[PDB]
């Protein structure tokens, strides 16, 4: 399956260089998709305390992450008309927050496609060509 | 009359220094509002034909105006977690699309507040404090 954008720094919204390149690939994929497909960039966090940062809440942290990924997709030519962003904060974890390994799973941004039934095949086919050799 | 933001020309998404000042004023207001109130930044166009611009459709234009305004609101300190943007293209004109003057009222971005009955008063006096005798 396709990978989400993982934030290794549990308390920041910083997009490093490896992640920028990956966002760029997804951007290239997105612009090839039919125009009636929209993209919702969703933001998540673990439950690491936020005390020594600027963020008041995990929602706020996840919003910044999703917004920033969205910003980057636009940088690489995705039309703002196909885009939106959402924050789920520390709700909806992939894994429980017991260990460092599982907490990384929770520090991510996920891409959601909004598509009809016919455009779903096209997305499927386009994603297959670019991601699986 | 708390006015929308009105763009300079039919096909432009440029935010002039005039509009910057006004968006900043709006950002100050938003930051005084209760945390449970959210802000949707709505973009519109007139129905001026789009040749000789980058934009392929009015929704792309309207989406770009609204995204830009939101990006500015954040720039001036508004929590991304309280923000979203929407494009309405040339739909929902506030005025008939005849004279240039009227077409321009349609080239605009509007701010919608999402609020419960109780936070509605808190928003009223905050807005009144800022835009009335």
From Swiss-Prot, chains A, B:
Q: In terms of domain of life, where is this protein from?
A: Bacteria
User: Where does the record say this protein resides?
Assistant: Cell inner membrane
Domain OmpA-like positions = 7-117
Q: How does it assemble?
A: Each stator complex is composed of 4 MotA and 2 MotB subunits. 2 A subunits and 1 B subunit are thought to form a single ion channel, so that each stator complex contains two channels.
Q: What does this protein do?
A: MotA and MotB comprise the stator element of the flagellar motor complex. Required for the rotation of the flagellar motor. Might be a linker that fastens the torque-generating machinery to the cell wall.
The record's comment on protein family reads: Belongs to the MotB family.
Name the UniProt record assigns to this protein: Motility protein B
Species of origin reads Helicobacter pylori (strain ATCC 700392 / 26695) (Campylobacter pylori)
Q: Highest lineage ranks of the organism? A: Bacteria, Pseudomonadati, Campylobacterota, Epsilonproteobacteria, Campylobacterales
Q: Which residues of the full protein are shown?
A: 126 to 252 of 257
């Amino acid at each position: 399956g396709i990978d989400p954008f993982t934030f290794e720094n549990a308390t920041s919204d910083a997009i490093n260089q490896d992640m920028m390149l990956y966002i760029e690939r997804i951007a290239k994929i997105i612009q090839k998709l039919p125009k009636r497909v929209h993209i919702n960039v969703r933001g998540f966090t673990d439950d690491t305390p936020l005390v020594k940062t600027r963020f008041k809440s995990h929602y706020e942290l996840a919003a910044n992450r999703a917004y920033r990924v969205m910003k980057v997709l636009i940088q690489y030519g995705v039309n703002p008309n196909q885009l939106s962003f959402s924050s789920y904060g520390s709700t909806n974890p992939i894994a429980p927050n017991d260990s460092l390994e599982n907490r990384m799973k929770n520090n991510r941004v996920e891409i959601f496609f909004s598509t009809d039934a016919n455009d779903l095949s096209k997305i499927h086919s386009i994603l297959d060509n670019e991601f699986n050799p």
